Structure formats: structure tokens, C-alpha cells
């Protein structure tokens, strides 16, 4: 049995930590909603 608890507001934060890259990937989506890499 699952329950929900408030975590905060949905706002954009100016001066937030900027990280992560931007990869262009060939992917496939199956009937089960699962992504996979196409090569």
C-alpha cells in the first residue's frame, strides 16, 4: 500500500547547479515501455 508525501514547489531556480551532457542516441521503444540502444 503506497502513499504520497509533499516534497516541495515546482519552480525554476536561478543560479542552480549546471551539470550533465547532451547525447544523441539511436533508441527503440518496445510494447512493455522499455527503451534499448539501436546499433
Amino acid at each position: 500500500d503506497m502513499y504520497i508525501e509533499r516534497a516541495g514547489d515546482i519552480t525554476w531556480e536561478k543560479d542552480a547547479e549546471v551539470t550533465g551532457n547532451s547525447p544523441r542516441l539511436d533508441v527503440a521503444l518496445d510494447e512493455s515501455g522499455d527503451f534499448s540502444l539501436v546499433e
Binding site: 500500500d1 516534497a7 547547479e17 547532451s22
Partner: protein
């Protein structure tokens, strides 16, 4: 019970202690999360009950109390903010420039930020604070890291 707009954690008491299985967005009285977080099961908000309304395994999305309300889209150019809510940790905005998932039915924005599976359903935002999609369904690239799609529903 609580129906105020905002980000919420999805918890379960079924396993050891209280375990965070995911995250969701409350907007216009509708709770939005990823399908694999709840598997379509009912949710509790204190003494109140949230019942599933719409869901789809392939899109990996589900809404509670009403139809999917989130219709903002990534513009394909700007940086976004993942409002990450990790297990046992405080909500934190992380800014990134999304990459692309090239599929046979079109391109999807994707965020390359590694977080625990219990962070699934955390909202991805634009500079206006609008939810452009949810984090938690993507792929594992060659080095072990996760790259999630910016998964957005359809507002009927």
C-alpha cells in the same frame, strides 16, 4: 487529503521500513507519475484515497483523480531543470541541456543525469516553471550511466 499543487514522493511500507519507490506531480487536482512506480495501484494521501484514472505501459505514464494535465513541451534548444527528489534527500533543481533520443517515430528530448530508480517521476521544467515531462524512463549507455527521456503525456 492533501491536493495542493507541487512535487510529492511516492512511498511504500510493504518493504523494510518506509521506502521511496518514486515521485509525482500534483497539478489541477490530478496526480501524475510514471507507470512503473505504482503499477496502476491506488494511492493514499493521509486519510484520503487517490484512484487511477488514465494509464499506459508503453508511454510509462499514469494519472490519478482526473485526466493527464501536463502539456508543456521542450523547445529543442534551451536548458531545462530536473527537479530531482531522491530517496531520503531534499528536492533539488539540477540544470542541464538535453540530448536527443532518435526513434523510428520521431525524436524525444533526453536528460543525462544519474539518479536512483526511486527518483522516477521527478518533473523536468522549462524557464517558466512548467512541467515539460517526467524523469525515469530511458536507457543505460556503455559506461553504466543512465540517460532518461523527457516523457510527456497528452492533455485531452
Amino acid at each position: 487529503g492533501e491536493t495542493t499543487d507541487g512535487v510529492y514522493r511516492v512511498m511504500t511500507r510493504r518493504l523494510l521500513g518506509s521506502t521511496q519507490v518514486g515521485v509525482g506531480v500534483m497539478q489541477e487536482g490530478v496526480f501524475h507519475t510514471m507507470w512503473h512506480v505504482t503499477k496502476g495501484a491506488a494511492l493514499r494521501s493521509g486519510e484520503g484515497r487517490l484512484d487511477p484514472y488514465w494509464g499506459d505501459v508503453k508511454q510509462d505514464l499514469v494519472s490519478y483523480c482526473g485526466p493527464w494535465k501536463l502539456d508543456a513541451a521542450w523547445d529543442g534548444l534551451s536548458e531545462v531543470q530536473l527537479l530531482a527528489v531522491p530517496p531520503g534527500e531534499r528536492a533539488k533543481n539540477i540544470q542541464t541541456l538535453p540530448g536527443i533520443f532518435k526513434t523510428k517515430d520521431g525524436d524525444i528530448g533526453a536528460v543525462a543525469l544519474d539518479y536512483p530508480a526511486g527518483t522516477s517521476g521527478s518533473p523536468i521544467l522549462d524557464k517558466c516553471g512548467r512541467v515539460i515531462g517526467l524523469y525515469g524512463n530511458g536507457v543505460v549507455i556503455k559506461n553504466g550511466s543512465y540517460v532518461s527521456a523527457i516523457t510527456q503525456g497528452k492533455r485531452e
